């Protein structure tokens, strides 16, 4: 009956990471940035709009009900705990404007989430697309543009889900600009490319990690100022091991065990500077986790939102942009010159804010 906000934070992040694994499997050798927490948060909003079997499919996948006493407040709390000027987010559901909505739903949604279900006239397609893109752009400090692309919606669209995040955290200890140098990055297909790489000598939190098959990985922690967020960087020791070996067994809990086993070793780290932007179409990932009804006409149950007309999700999309740089203000080597996993984590709650694979910086 009573659960500390860490409970939902782990379920949310666990589910978010499972969605990431589906995305990572679908884009084997491409860059991906993604927010496990972001997709959990927006799917929690979608739980409230849905009914019956559509709702159950989402609850079975996420492992909790947004209706339950304690949940809505805990998420609200979590959001406050997590979130500035280096991080900005927005969650939004847009539904066709003249559709009769269930009595009391909009105030009820607002009470549980402190944001509104947006109403728009999709039959004026470009106006509708502009309004949605303007909402997203203005609630990510102008960093996420054109989230909803030309052709993504049309005259017959009735419901659209949107999630967007921008991250540009500044590391606690900066990389000296003068040590930034061009160096060969080895891509998964055997080819190389010369890219700007940062270098820093320091005592880094570090652990080795060995999978059940015997291959091992270097895992470094790079704290951010604020002493609460950290980026974890992970790559196989051997050049020939694919990064998917790691991503196919990733969990929120595994990452906590990594942190648990770390000690501060003195190392020269060489890490590529990168700036990645990705739009994930969430449909196939979520379908693969059992949430199939919501995307299907005359199957989806959105009777909590409207019990007047049928409804289904036309688009569920996340767009994230992450930037990693020297972070400046006013000895054995670890070289990340091969594809690597990164994880941005909030260490008190264990929340996974961001996850990605850098296949080519």
């Amino acid at each position: 009956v009573h659960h500390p906000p860490s409970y939902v934070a782990h379920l949310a992040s666990d589910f978010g990471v499972r969605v990431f694994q589906q995305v990572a499997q679908a884009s084997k050798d491409r860059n991906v940035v993604f927010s496990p927490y972001g997709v959990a948060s927006v799917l929690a909003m979608l739980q409230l709009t849905t009914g019956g079997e559509t709702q159950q499919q989402i609850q079975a996948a996420m492992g909790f009900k947004i209706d339950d006493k304690g949940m809505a407040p805990a998420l609200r709390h979590l959001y406050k705990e997590l979130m500035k000027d280096e991080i900005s987010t927005t969650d939004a559901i847009f539904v066709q404007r003249d559709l009769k909505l269930v009595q009391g739903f909009m105030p009820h949604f607002f009470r549980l989430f402190r944001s509104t279900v947006k109403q728009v006239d999709f039959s004026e397609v470009e106006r509708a697309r502009f309004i949605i893109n303007d909402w997203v752009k203005t609630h990510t400090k102008g960093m996420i543009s054109n989230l909803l692309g030309k052709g993504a919606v049309d005259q017959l669209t009735r419901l659209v889900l949107v999630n967007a995040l921008y991250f540009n955290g500044q590391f606690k200890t900066p990389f000296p600009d003068s040590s930034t140098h061009r160096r060969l990055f080895h891509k998964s297909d055997g080819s190389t490319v010369s890219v700007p790489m940062m270098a820093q000598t320091n005592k880094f939190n570090y652990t080795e990690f060995t999978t059940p098959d015997g291959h091992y990985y270097d895992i470094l922690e790079l704290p951010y100022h604020g002493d609460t967020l950290s980026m974890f960087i992970a790559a196989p020791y051997e050049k020939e091991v694919p990064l998917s070996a790691l991503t196919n067994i990733l969990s929120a809990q595994l990452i906590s065990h990594w942190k648990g086993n770390m000690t501060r070793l003195p190392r020269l780290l060489v890490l590529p500077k990168f700036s990645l932007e990705t739009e994930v179409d969430l449909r196939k990932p979520l379908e693969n986790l059992g949430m199939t009804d919501m995307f299907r006409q005359f199957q989806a149950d959105f009777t909590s939102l409207s019990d007047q007309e049928p409804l289904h999700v036309a688009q569920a999309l996340q767009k994230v942009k992450i930037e990693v740089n020297e972070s400046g203000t006013v000895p054995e080597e670890i070289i990340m010159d091969r594809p690597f996993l990164f994880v941005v984590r909030h260490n008190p709650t264990g929340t996974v804010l961001f996850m990605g694979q850098v296949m080519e910086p």
Partner: nanobody
Amino acid sequence: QVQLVESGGGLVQPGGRLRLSCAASGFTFRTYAMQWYRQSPGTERELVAAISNIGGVTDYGDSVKGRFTISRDNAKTTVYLEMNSLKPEDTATYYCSAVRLPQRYWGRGTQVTVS
């Protein structure tokens, strides 16, 4: 100096259970994966169970079907294989192995017999 000594094997009836154990020494246990293999007269060594060095990531052979659980204690440099719902098909010598590639060590095995 490296040693892997398995114990806990024996005779049981169908539907019986056993807890295998392997004490390890002579290497940095905490950085190695631990594995269990089985072999009976006239067949190859088949992977039964595998665990990561930390985090408890596991892998199981097809015919285990959630009947066997692999665990480990790094402070005691020991690895365990809890086996339940034993069948005549499980009759074999069970070998513990430690691996951090390309280095692999083997134990002597311990016999599991199911009538």
